[PDB]
Design a protein around this ligand. Structure first.
Ligand code: B12
Ligand code: B12
Lengths: 252, 453, 453, 252
């Protein structure tokens, strides 16, 4: 008997007559990728196909699912929308996710601090798990590190249904010199808590291209740990204000 | 020209060539999102007929972004053989389709004829082709290139090894490489997308790839798929150069989004000529895909199929070793389901072969699209019958880091043994010497990475 | 046996083998309509794992309609080689899947092993197979039969000439025949569905087919696809007998719906041996398809994939020259879309080949289903790579009388020249003598029914 | 300069260098199958493909076309209804379309005649165009034919969203000795006006099979003409009542 979501199922070696079986364990240890599962002819083995299919059913569910509106409230965040109403419309209309709705603009002017040096924005994006799991490890050392021997920090807020070009509008309205977006990148098959940072110096909707952004991706416990990633993003924000550039316009 | 036809008693009127090109497309979610799609099936067929009545001249003289405004348009127009063009300029697109598909049209015939084409004309043919038209037409148009392997010989089928990791950990990269070679994957390239665009990190990844290559004397290429500028920097400072990669887009504004100038790609050719460990004359690697120009705000009212053809016209100028579309890599906003992803894959491959580039495909989908692994397996086999130059390989197709599903190592071995196709002849020689392959088929002791130890 | 498993901490319990067989299916429209489908994707995978862990003896000893109550169950059970069965009875379905797919398993290995299967076990293997599993699995299980042509040899690919007419007008039938032959279609059979089910109409349509066969000395066979009783009468009263046809269903209730008894098919074999103009030892022709038992009220709570496998166990008893599924012939109630029709096509063909019958496919759709002609061309090529013994052929695939769309004459010529496949060797020889084919390829003069005049 | 729906496009011969082109014309004339369009390599010629795709666009529209209910009122027919509400539900549920809803049973027991010798039912089924184009040519000489030299004729009515096994419930409710149903089959590519008749002697929901039905199919102007097909059905209904049998149970 086997749970396909178990650690034993993940550790399985399916190569049937190994050349060197002690090497096979060390190779399976080194990797999260589905190495060492063997074959039937040129086809996947049955257990490997079954665990693939199980992980896909679970990965499909991480797409649809949404953060509680009260989780954001109990985190002490402003919640604000894009132009998108719901999760079904989010997936088909990227253009609407790159724009704040009319009430979101007015809330940002009402309730957020004007002309910050560094603005931190959190969005669910395409993975709710990415921002739900990682938050308490990334965000408090991010807000401390920008303050502690640093400068004028913005008040952090949540955008529901955000895609990354929305941070150009956020930088324009708030007058922000640096805009940091932490956002859920699209879910992988066995893993859905991967976070990315997108950061841009002094953005403008008319002129800013994607290459002007710096990306820090794969933030999670299987990637770069969210604790030590916060120190990377603080260092990046410091450098961005120093040389007055982001992305491909940065040195070294 | 006519922008106008009657179908079942109703007049169907179009504004320009751009609108005809857009609406002649098979239904996809990207064209609807762009606002450019047909309103019904009747108007789609009307657009197809209007397109097929237009001449090569009509569509050549109306590129979707103007000559003076776009450096990609200039590159595509200036690369035309005008003698080849003057032979075919008064052909209808109907006649050009029937010429391509004809059994009396040889590989040598198309070799001159394709030099008279522009990307918009290449797109125009694809739009009035059925799925079997796209597959058969592409198959009778082989494109052969050479690095340390030869790719695209009829009767062969290649694969990129894609050993990606969340941390660029060199033991996890190596473990996936040993797995891939044991299934006979890697004759196209061993190609890592890195987490950090960084010379120290790029060189360490490249040292790991070429560690395996030099140990077992493998005839293949290494690549690290960072931005082209950081690749060039790393290779200049003395990291092993194999293939040099760039993602490309079919407009100048799309290239600006990617941070790419044309002179970077010129520099990549010159750096390859000075530095790279490549026996043959082809050393560049591009990736393309439908939706990218639309994402960049850089499609200029044009559909994503016409834009994707312009990628291939751009790519052709630099005579790369390999190009692949990345067909379902982005998600459902541009291609929604199985049917759309298959159709786009067949379109992109046909258009690449017609443009005369070494065209493969990442047969792939995302977890937020209406799609599963059976679609990858449907599409990889259809494209293999079309003479697709290469696909990807990962352990069961699971990218742990780019967060999508491509084809397995298993899948290349399946395709080869199903269709009696071989690897690259140089790489097949190596597989036979390693005891991994006999007569095209995986031996008993294949599929096992512990063989290398 | 276990009828339960744990997936992600959740216990998944199933009532019987029948429910596990039902819910392990890939999603299709008819399983939901039967009320037998999985409630979620997780339960589908849980049903798949429970099925894979179930043994051959588990599924053999639980057929979906009981031995006492069903003559088709009895026929399937009584045909089992018990020595073959006793070798494999303690194998899991997982192990049987991996046995079928293995390159160390030969055609002769499967030749004996398949005799210990029943249809439900055949279905159970297909349910835990991916699309590429179904294609590669079927390809390594060729089935060869012989009438006046040999069908099913690896490297060959055959086609039914289907020259149907609204009035059974003999000029319209002959016109479509001359068209099909000029594309090299008709080595499987020249097979008419008649509009009227009576002897003198049957005989006149048979005279028209065999008028063409005798004039040009074509190695093939004719068929008129009325009810088997009317065919027998016509042939007894002296019409030319070629193949004898019957639509079948996978239960006794389903046969009673069709108005067929098993003794009619026994009579068909005996009438063939006395009367029919057939050089080889096979002369029967069956058609099948998913949904037919459901329509008849005769599935008894079983899914349509299990029920369709039972068709093949039934067909196998009578050792027919050809069988095809008619995959999208009925409509969207049972298979809704492109991907459902493809998946069913691959399932049906794999299950046929595993049951040891000469399995082809009518790659087809209806106009009230969510499908088009690009689906037909997708599916025909995939199935051709799986070594599908034959498809249909009609002028552009338009049936003017059965009101659906199948594959074109063009499509067989396309598949043959794409995949380097030949006709039946006897029929290929005829095509070369007519100047229609050279080296597997249509000549200049081919595709032109005027050649026969 | 071509309409793809025109007669010229229908008659087009596309064979490139024909052996005998006058034969091709007569072959094209002999059939409504799409012969003689030639090829490009092994593939269809462009115009043949275009005319295919044009016809398919028209064909898809015909499947979800419906009668006006006020057309049904103007024919003098009772409209009665299945369990199905919409055309989208009809295409996905066969099982609801072959039994009547709860107000349909009470309508038939109040308004229609009891125990007829012959009972005629009309349904749209899968094609509305099949019973709209053909009605004036089918129904008058059929309903006259069963009365004029015959016996007891039933009152005809319309079933919306009907599939053919609904006529077993109609035969049980009305006590009908012969139940004829004229119904739209699947639309073809080039044509959507093909009518079928399905007919039982004395049907019963528990007992009767599909083989107990006689079918006569392809009733339109390009098959058997609806006038002379009405003479076929009356002769068939006479032969049903004589030998007390239908379908496979009928002689010769
Ligand atoms: C999907 C994807 C793309 C898509 C873009 C998606 C779209 N247009 O809708 C395409 C195929 C276009 C693409 C292209 C490139 N990408 Co990319 N991409 C990804 C991927 C797999 C998903 C990111 C995601 O889920 N975003 C979250 C969603 C919610 O945001 P979104 O608004 O819907 O999408 C935006 C961003 O994804 C952004 N984007 C995508 N890639 C990149 C790369 C950089 C450097 C930047 C600044 C932005 C950016 O473009 C979209 C704007 O509409 C990640 C890998 C990962 N695990 O994250 C890599 C990844 C972010 N990309 C990478 C790279 C290098 C590239 C290229 C520069 C490749 C090249 N060498 O030329 C190009 C150019 C990008 C550009 N300047 O526009 C690297 C970034 C490395 C880094 N630390 O800077 C990553 C991390 C993958 C890797 N190789 O490690 N990519
Ligand atoms: C689809 C179809 C079937 C399907 C039925 C499933 C279904 N849901 O319809 C399948 C694949 C099972 C099938 C099987 C056969 N069919 Co059929 N079928 C058709 C088709 C293409 C559609 C008819 C239609 O649209 N009906 C209208 C819709 C609205 O009704 P429905 O409730 O959805 O469908 C019912 C009827 O179609 C009925 N039915 C289907 N076929 C037949 C055949 C006969 C003789 C009878 C009495 C009833 C019948 O079964 C369904 C009840 O659930 C027609 C072709 C045409 N020209 O229309 C042939 C057609 C009706 N069938 C034909 C034949 C001969 C057969 C077979 C007897 C084949 C054989 N020779 O062994 C078998 C057995 C059928 C039986 N006796 O039960 C002939 C009938 C000849 C005649 N006048 O007697 C036709 C006209 C085609 C032809 N060959 O000319 N068929």
């Amino acid at each position: 008997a086997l749970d396909l979501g178990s650690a034993e199922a993940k550790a399985w070696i399916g190569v049937e007559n190994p050349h060197r079986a002690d090497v096979l364990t060390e190779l399976r240890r080194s990797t999260v990728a589905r190495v060492c599962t063997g074959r039937a002819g040129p086809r996947p083995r049955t257990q490997a196909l079954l665990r693939f299919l199980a992980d896909h059913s679970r990965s499909k569910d991480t797409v649809l699912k949404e953060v509680p509106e009260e989780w954001v409230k109990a985190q002490g965040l402003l919640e604000v929308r894009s132009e998108i109403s719901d999760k079904n419309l989010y997936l088909t209309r990227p253009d609407m996710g790159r724009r704040l709705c009319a009430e979101a603009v007015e809330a940002l002017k009402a309730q957020c601090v004007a002309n910050p040096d560094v603005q931190v924005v959190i969005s669910d994006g395409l993975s709710t798990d990415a921002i739900t799991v990682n938050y308490e490890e990334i965000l408090p050392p991010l807000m401390a590190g920008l303050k502690q021997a640093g400068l004028k920090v913005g008040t952090p807020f949540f955008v529901r249904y955000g895609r990354v070009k929305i941070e150009d509008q956020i930088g324009e309205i708030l007058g922000a010199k640096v805009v940091i977006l932490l956002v859920g990148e699209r879910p992988g098959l066995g893993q859905s808590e991967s976070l990315s940072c997108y950061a841009v110096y002094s953005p403008r909707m008319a002129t800013t291209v994607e290459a002007d952004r710096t990306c820090i991706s794969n933030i999670h416990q299987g990637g770069t740990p969210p604790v030590e990633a916060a120190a990377v993003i603080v260092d990046l924000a410091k450098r961005m204000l120093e040389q007055k550039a982001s992305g491909i316009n940065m040195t070294r | 020209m006519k922008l106008k036809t009657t179908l079942f008693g109703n007049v169907y009127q179009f504004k320009d060539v751009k609108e005809v090109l857009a609406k002649a497309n098979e239904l996809r979610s990207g064209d609807v999102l762009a606002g450019v799609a047909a309103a019904s099936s009747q108007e789609r067929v009307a657009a197809k007929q209007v397109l097929s009545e237009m001449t090569v001249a009509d569509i050549r003289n109306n590129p979707v972004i103007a000559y003076e405004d776009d450096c990609v348009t200039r590159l595509i127009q200036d690369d035309v053989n005008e003698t080849a063009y003057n032979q075919i300029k008064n052909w209808s697109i109907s006649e050009l389709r029937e010429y391509v598909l004809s059994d009396e049209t040889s590989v040598d015939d198309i070799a001159f004829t394709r030099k008279g084409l522009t990307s918009e004309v290449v797109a125009a043919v694809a739009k009035i082709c059925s799925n079997a038209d796209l597959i058969y037409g592409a198959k009778k148009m082989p494109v052969i290139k050479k690095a340390n392997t030869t790719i695209g010989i009829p009767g062969t089928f290649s694969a990129r090894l894609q050993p990606n990791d969340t941390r660029d950990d060199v033991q996890s990269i190596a473990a996936q490489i040993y797995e891939g070679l044991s299934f006979g994957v890697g004759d196209a390239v061993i190609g890592v997308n890195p987490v950090t665009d960084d010379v120290e990190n790029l060189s360490r990844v490249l040292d790991t790839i070429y560690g395996v290559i030099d140990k077992f004397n493998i005839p293949t290429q290494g690549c690290v798929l960072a931005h082209v500028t950081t690749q060039i920097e790393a290779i200049r400072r003395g990291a092993p150069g194999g293939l040099i990669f760039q993602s490309i887009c079919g407009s100048e504004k799309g290239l600006k989004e990617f941070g790419v100038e044309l002179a970077m790609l010129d520099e990549a050719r010159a750096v390859g000529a000075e530095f790279n460990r490549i026996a043959g004359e082809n050393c560049l690697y591009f990736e393309t895909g439908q939706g990218s120009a639309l994402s960049a705000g850089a499609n200029f009212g044009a559909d994503q199929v016409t834009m994707e053809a312009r990628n291939y016209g751009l790519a052709r100028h630099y005579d790369p070793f390999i190009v692949n579309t990345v067909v379902g890599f982005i998600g459902p906003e541009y291609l929604y389901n199985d049917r759309q992803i298959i159709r786009a894959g067949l379109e992109d491959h046909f258009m690449g072969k017609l443009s005369g580039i070494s065209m493969g495909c990442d047969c792939c989908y995302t977890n937020h699209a209406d799609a599963d692994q059976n679609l990858n397996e449907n599409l990889m086999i259809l494209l293999a019958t079309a003479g697709c130059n290469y696909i990807m390989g990962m352990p069961l197709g699971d990218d742990i880091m780019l967060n999508y599903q491509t084809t397995a190592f298993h899948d290349t071995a399946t395709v080869r043994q199903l269709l009696n196709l071989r690897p690259s002849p140089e790489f097949e020689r190596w597989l036979e010497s390693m005891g991994i392959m006999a007569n095209g088929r995986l031996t008993k002791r294949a599929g096992d990475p512990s063989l290398f130890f």
